């Protein structure tokens, strides 16, 4: 997160860190056994870390669980990052409590103009890299699809949404990938891609989660 | 390397990749058993990969050897990155040949105005991150110490040198760390730090290797 602020400890209780020996992506806990992340965060072994605030210091609220099934959307296209969504079933349910809780799936697609919260331990600089220890938060609005399509001529599908500021300075960045944008209590987007980080006229683009609620539900049920 | 070009295959034969399960820094082979890298690339287990061109495809010229002793400069200061130099003794000597060869230590400190070659598999973008598969090369001059000190008021020691372009656009970046800047056949610098990557007025700064030749020699001899 570039241009954000440190989240109050465990105030984003559905945020998880996906770790392979190091944090490489974030995700959202949607029930006590399933996590939604970006299909481009796929790795064959993933340890999911919940209850995290400082990703590097054991603070005493963490639960670390291994992914048992990691399911990428069957139409995920690696080249356009269309359908960049993945589901991870944990190998055992987690203990839901104050610092570890669920986020709701969307009842409808949020309108342009909605303020959302994006969070993650991803890159905090618009040039070079600096990985933060503490979870970062960003308040940012959902942008009109016309503004999204204008920034990325020919690359935005109906499954992608832009969130951010066209003047730049504040955005998600590599490492935030797979994590949440929550607007009015529901998961509306997943951090997916953008050109650079926090650049003028290059807003971040997010998987539009209200397009996948049937798939997320079919898949949890069949699994 | 931002703004560079793909090196001809195995034309930088002293370049090595330091790997912990992934490439995280570069270095230079200075004899058949010792590698010089940046002290900030220190990890307790390192696999050194030599003969590399595509860091991701076995091409048939690689030699992969484990580090046996990893020695950081005793005055390395983690906060200012002063004395950012480290020596790695390989657990067995490598087979020196066309694609795996030594680079010479400096006979004197190169003058400002010298053209050098910097290489590495580090970040290729000035905003966001993109790691390349193929080794990248950059031709860049050594800058006057006054220009270096002017860009970074209060942070340049006598052990640091700037290389690059004050207009920005071309620079080394995270991941190139620890690798070589060679000028007229001798290792003159080690990729160390800079603000951002390829930004106007923020040239990269490098450990000045001609200040450490006695230490490098003492240390190889005592070990």
UniProtKB/Swiss-Prot annotation, chains A, B:
Its main location: secreted. It catalyses: Preferential cleavage: Arg-|-Xaa, Lys-|-Xaa. Keywords: Calcium, Digestion, Disulfide bond, Hydrolase, Metal-binding, Protease, Secreted, Serine protease, Signal, Zymogen. It is found in: Secreted, Extracellular space. The active site is at residues 40, 84, 177. One of its GO terms (molecular function) is calcium ion binding. Residues 1-221 form the Peptidase S1 domain. InterPro entries: Peptidase_S1_PA, Peptidase_S1_PA_chymotrypsin, Peptidase_S1A, Serine_Proteases_S1, Trypsin_dom, TRYPSIN_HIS, TRYPSIN_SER. It is an enzyme of class 3 (hydrolase). This is Anionic trypsin-2. It comes from Rattus norvegicus. The lineage of its organism: Eukaryota, Metazoa, Chordata, Craniata, Vertebrata. The gene is Prss2.
């Amino acid at each position: 997160i570039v241009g954000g602020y440190t989240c109050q400890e465990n105030s984003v209780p559905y945020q998880v860190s996906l770790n392979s020996g190091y944090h490489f992506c974030g995700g959202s806990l949607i029930n006590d056994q399933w996590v939604v992340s970006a299909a481009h965060c796929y790795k064959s072994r993933i340890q999911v870390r919940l209850g995290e605030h400082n990703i590097n210091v054991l603070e005493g609220n963490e639960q670390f669980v291994n992914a048992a099934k990691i399911i990428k959307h069957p139409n995920f296209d690696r080249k356009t990052l269309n359908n960049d969504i993945m589901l991870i079933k944990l190998s055992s349910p987690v203990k839901l409590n104050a610092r570890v809780a669920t986020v709701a799936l969307p009842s409808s697609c949020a309108p342009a103009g909605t303020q959302c919260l994006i969070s993650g331990w991803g890159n905090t600089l618009s040039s070079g890299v600096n990985e933060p220890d503490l979870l970062q938060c960003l308040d940012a609005p959902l942008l009109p699809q016309a503004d999204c399509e204008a920034s990325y001529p020919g690359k935005i599908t109906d499954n992608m949404v832009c969130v951010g500021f066209l003047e730049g300075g504040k955005d998600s960045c590599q490492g935030d990938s797979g994590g949440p944008v929550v607007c009015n209590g529901e998961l509306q987007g997943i951090v997916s891609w953008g050109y650079g980080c926090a650049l003028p006229d290059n807003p971040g683009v997010y998987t539009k989660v209200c397009n996948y609620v049937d798939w997320i539900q079919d898949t949890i049920a069949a699994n």
